Structure 1
Amino acid sequence: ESTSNSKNVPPDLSICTFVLEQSLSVRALQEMLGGGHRTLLYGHAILLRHSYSGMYLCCLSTSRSSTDKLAF
């Protein structure tokens, strides 16, 4: 969503927003076999979430796009 042309047209932020539900280290890894307003550090393992839709942007098996011919 090109916001640089803000005066010629408006952008939409409601479909650009994201929310930080979780943030850990790489060592925090359990596989199954909170704290409350923690901070954020470089190198942490983050989790995003779209605001108004609950589709957690996360590691998934996306193997579709072939514009570059090797990229996800």
Structure 2
Amino acid sequence: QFLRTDDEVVLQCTATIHKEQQKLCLAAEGFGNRLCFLESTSNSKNVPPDLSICTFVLEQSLSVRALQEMLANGHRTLLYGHAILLRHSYSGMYLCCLSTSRKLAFDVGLQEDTTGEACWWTIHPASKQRSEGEKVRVGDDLILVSVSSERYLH
């Protein structure tokens, strides 16, 4: 039903490009890839996408209180109004903003260390119906912003 820590999930978009609801999911490789990218899950009947570079582990998810503590140095539920620590399941690395541009946005890929704001992504539900202060459930809509660059998961 809901979502706590240490449970396994993917993200996905359904980008309707050329009016095709392309069920493209996130995909970062590691071990020689320092970037995330996409992965189509629409044609499951003939091209099964790989899952391993798409699974992501909810290591932690607190508010500003705990966050400030960590920077100033088994089922915690995950809340609209939290920034979380998210690991890549396969590589073990930690997804974050990357400080290059390839326009004036910022790149997206793995890193090791949990220091800095980069490994933190604040959760906002993109509806008035949901709001901050309650658990994230099965299959909810959400908006993630960086904490280093404070730009959107775009």
User: When the two structures are superposed, what TM-score results if normalisation uses the length of structure 1?
Assistant: 0.74
Gaps of 5+ in 1: none
Rounded to whole Å, the distance in 1 between the matches of 2:41 and 2:78 is: 26
User: When the two structures are superposed, what TM-score results if normalisation uses the length of structure 2?
Assistant: 0.38
Change (3 A) 1:39 1:29: closer
Give the CA deviation at 1:70: 1.3
Q: Which has the higher helix share?
A: 2
8 Å CA contact retained: 1:22, 1:47 = yes
Greater Rg by CA: 1
Give the CA deviation at 1:11: 0.5
8 Å CA contact retained: 1:17, 1:50 = yes
Change (3 A) 1:55 1:33: closer
Give the CA deviation at 1:28: 1.9
Give the CA deviation at 1:30: 3.9
Rounded to whole Å, the distance in 1 between the matches of 2:71 and 2:85 is: 21
Segment drifting more, 17-26 vs 35-44: 35-44
CA RMSD of aligned residues (A): 3.6
Identity %: 97
Aligned residue-pair number: 68
Q: Which has the higher strand share?
A: 2
Kindly provide the CA deviation profile for residues 1-41 of structure 1, in whole angstroms up to 9, marking residues without a partner as x: 10001112111001100000011102223466899211111
> Which protein has greater RCO, CA pairs closer than 8 Å, 6+ apart?
1
Change (3 A) 1:29 1:40: closer
